[PDB]
Amino acid sequence: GYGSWEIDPKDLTFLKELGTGVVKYGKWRGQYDVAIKMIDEFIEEAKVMMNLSHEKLVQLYGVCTKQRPIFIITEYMANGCLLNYLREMRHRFQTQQLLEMCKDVCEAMEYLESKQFLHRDLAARNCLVNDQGVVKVSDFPVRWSPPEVLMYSKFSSKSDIWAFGVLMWEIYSLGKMPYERFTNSETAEHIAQGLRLYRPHLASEKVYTIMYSCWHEKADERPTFKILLSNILDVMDEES
Ligand SMILES: Cc1ccc(NC(=O)/C=C/c2ccccc2)cc1C(=O)Nc1cnc2[nH]c(-c3ccccc3)nc2c1
Secondary structure (H helix, E strand, O other): OOOOEEOHHEEEEEEEEEEEEEEEEEEOOOOOOOOEEOHHHHHHHHHHHHHOOOOEOOOEEEEEEEOOOOOEEEEOOOOOOHHHHHHHHHHHHOHHHHHHHHHHHHHHHHHHHHHHOOOOOOOOEEEEEEOOOOOOOOOOOHOOOOOOHHOOOOOHHHHHHHHHHHHHHHOOOOOOOOOOOOOOHHHHHHOOOOOOOOOOOHHHHHHHHHHHOOOOOOOHHHHHHHHHHHHHHHHHHHOO
16 A cells, blocks of 8 residues: 555546646546546656655655556646747746746755755656746656766766756757757767857856856766755846
């Protein structure tokens, strides 16, 4: 048994399909909006989620494991995927809020960092946005990877840092694909040569400094999420 995490499937009301396992929108005891994910490796995700809880991380509500198919149930993020939000919902946010989106993600990642947990696929496509426009972290990505990952499969806290910088770039470019004119192969070559993503027009020089610091050639020279959070706050205070 999964203790207090076990949900009675009878308490669920399915309403709409969200993405295809299969994720659906519904209500839990007719009161709470939820997302429901249908299918040992699948249940591994839930176990990870039972041990992680933060305001900017998509929250597990429970699991249905006594019935096939098995369900994983989370909070419902009304505005969907961050990538699509950036591309399709620009009428709903101003330039000042771009940094707030970065701060939301940075807070989630600082929490993960403190738990010595690696995300390994940080990108806008893996973030969700709620009804209030709050961004939360959810769940080969060459364009989000540092040279040591592409060359040696060297994953660390510093590979999440690199990926975060690319995410910041995604936000400030309003959801452009990083290295938009290159293939994955070309991107890897260019990254190894020390080429870096240009400054998006919406990014001030101080904002760009933050994202650029995430892309230092030497992993050990990249900041931590604790440092990045303080930098973002400082810029927020100066530019707002
Ligand atoms: C159901 C489910 C189960 C598990 C996970 N796993 C993690 O979040 C990982 C966390 C994590 C793990 C480790 C570390 C960090 C984070 C996610 C989900 C999940 O897709 N939830 C969801 C919520 N709201 C949504 N809104 C829309 C939408 C709305 C409108 C349009 C389109 C789409 N789709 C949604 C989907």
